[PDB]
Design a binder for this molecule. Sequence first.
Ligand SMILES: Cc1nn(-c2nc3ccccc3[nH]2)c(O)c1C(c1ccccn1)c1c(C)nn(-c2nc3ccccc3[nH]2)c1O
Ligand SMILES: Cc1nn(-c2nc3ccccc3[nH]2)c(O)c1C(c1ccccn1)c1c(C)nn(-c2nc3ccccc3[nH]2)c1O
Ligand SMILES: [Zn+2]
Ligand SMILES: [Zn+2]
Lengths: 324, 335
Amino acid sequence: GASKLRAVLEKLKLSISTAAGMVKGVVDHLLLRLKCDSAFRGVGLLYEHVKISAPNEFDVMFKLEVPRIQLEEYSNTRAYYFVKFKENPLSQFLEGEILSASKMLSKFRKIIMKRGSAVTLLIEKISVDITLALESKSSWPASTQEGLRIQNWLSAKVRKQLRLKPFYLVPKHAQEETWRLSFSHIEKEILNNHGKSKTCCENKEEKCCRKDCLKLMKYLLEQLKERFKDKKHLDKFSSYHVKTAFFHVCTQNPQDSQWDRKDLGLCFDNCVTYFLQCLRTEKLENYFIPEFNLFSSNLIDKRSKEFLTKQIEYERNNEFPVFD
Amino acid sequence: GASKLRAVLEKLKLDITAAGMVKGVVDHLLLRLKCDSAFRGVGLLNSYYEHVKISAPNEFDVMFKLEVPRIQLEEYSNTRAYYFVKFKNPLSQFLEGEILSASKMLSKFRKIIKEEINDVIMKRGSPAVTLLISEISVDITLALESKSSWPASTQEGLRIQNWLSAKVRKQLRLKPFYLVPKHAKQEETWRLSFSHIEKEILNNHGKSKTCCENKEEKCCRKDCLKLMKYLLEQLKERFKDKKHLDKFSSYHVKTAFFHVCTQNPQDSQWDRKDLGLCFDNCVTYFLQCLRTEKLENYFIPEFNLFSSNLIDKRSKEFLTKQIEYERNNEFPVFD
Ligand SMILES: Cc1nn(-c2nc3ccccc3[nH]2)c(O)c1C(c1ccccn1)c1c(C)nn(-c2nc3ccccc3[nH]2)c1O
Ligand SMILES: Cc1nn(-c2nc3ccccc3[nH]2)c(O)c1C(c1ccccn1)c1c(C)nn(-c2nc3ccccc3[nH]2)c1O
Ligand SMILES: [Zn+2]
Ligand SMILES: [Zn+2]
């Protein structure tokens, strides 16, 4: 039954660098204007399409390095932090000793169109969501110590090299002045360098279906969210849950031969299965922050997960009619 | 006879505390050099110390790097490896016309180091300075760092695509390259250096990313390289009172080994069980390079390390005879 999945992927691919050229013009302009300011002088780039079905909705991130940062964990949430400082161009945005996300974002929007993580620009069909992020080159927070468990797949050496890279903090409510950990750069680097073999997907002998499986999962969730957009059951699910579950599946299946392209049908099915399991048991560990449960009852209620479970099982039993 | 090979490797493994002493000197030198405007951005390539000889644990090798932004290279004759350094300036005090003088820069480098050393002893281009700590030796090399694109002479080198992948080769070529002062057969030229890339490929050396991180994936690449280098070191020692082997170096061994890695890209061609054959096939390849007088620089394909203009055929024939004898008699020089 994988032929239908292949048809779906063909249609998704036929739907580019033009629109991105327009977006690039606008983003370079905005970054120059921001760089003229004392507080955002170090602003910089770390295009991405959050929804695979929306080729004209872009997502970019403006970073800003914060040297010698001091993090205060909010409420043992493992993912949300106050940003204190350990000579400070962000002093304009302090509320006591904490960097205020409110003031910083207010000024950021000022320099920058439409309304945490911060601005939606139009450039008649193209939309661009811009998120502000602090960059830190300090070691990763202690809540990540047991995350990114790629040692049996991409290797312990790669894990060390990745953990030597910066981490990011985006403004997000937990209490209004908290910042949330972001590792989207690591997710991207893994997705584009995803095999146990370094030449994975560089030759016919070593073609795998990891990326295709992820795209099919994201498209399944997007189609289901669209179809039931009039109900509220699926409003809290996002491609972040899909990507986290996909990375967990990659950890469970670390060999390239478990992702042979010929087995797309099974591989995708496996992905679906794991996601469904996560829904039923209400457990989806953040891939980088293992004590953060994205499927906690404090975040998504039981009924929403049961509804998504039923809809997905229906789709799989009927060869995914929502793909059409 | 692979058991003897593994015995040799065991003995080579069995103090490197010594580095401590090395570090103590190195840091201090770097402190002093950083007070000068010309050497303001000096640092360690980074690992403070390396060893060019597997059998000289007290003989260390250090590279001090210094970034030259907006560098302009001009290739000497068509050497493909040697260049004059010009600029597109804290180094303007060493400028002879429009070209950076290796002689003046080196003179100042060693002057500063000598004055700092006096507060260790100094021995009199590339290993700019040799310091003897206590009774421990440290060869220090000055290198310019350029973060611009690699020179055009390297465009078809580093052919690791079928071994370490094309993505890895692109990432490696995005790293800086280095220029070490070195005279050419002309005394104000600089020679390309990629020893950082060499270290990276040796310590991340398999097609599989988990090569040598578990029992199922142990390969014998590093052991074959160690055995080749020990073979050369022992042969150069045994015949050091003749000049026949003075021009051969661990660089030749390493270059030939990397070529063999390109020829045998699969981890299953380096299974630890097959150490004996793998090493043999390394020796053979090196031998081939000696007979045909051809050993392309792994990063600069048109620079022939075994050219008749660099090493004459008498030396290559002597080394071939010695190596073939050793291989036919189960390597008694290892003892
Ligand atoms: C990925 C992502 N898909 N996505 C999405 N998928 C859709 C599918 C159909 C229709 C609409 C859709 N919208 C979305 O809205 C995000 C955002 C995001 C995208 C861009 C900018 C900001 N946010 C995000 C979220 C919802 N959660 N999240 C996150 N939760 C965390 C918890 C702990 C630690 C880190 C965390 N990161 C995150 O990054
Ligand atoms: C000679 C040498 N050419 N070379 C080189 N030639 C090039 C030609 C074109 C492009 C790049 C090139 N790089 C190089 O990088 C060295 C180094 C070295 C190191 C530090 C400073 C200067 N050169 C070295 C090594 C790698 N081994 N080695 C050595 N092996 C020994 C074994 C036994 C006994 C003594 C030994 N000495 C040694 O001298
Ligand atoms: Zn692949
Ligand atoms: Zn190995």
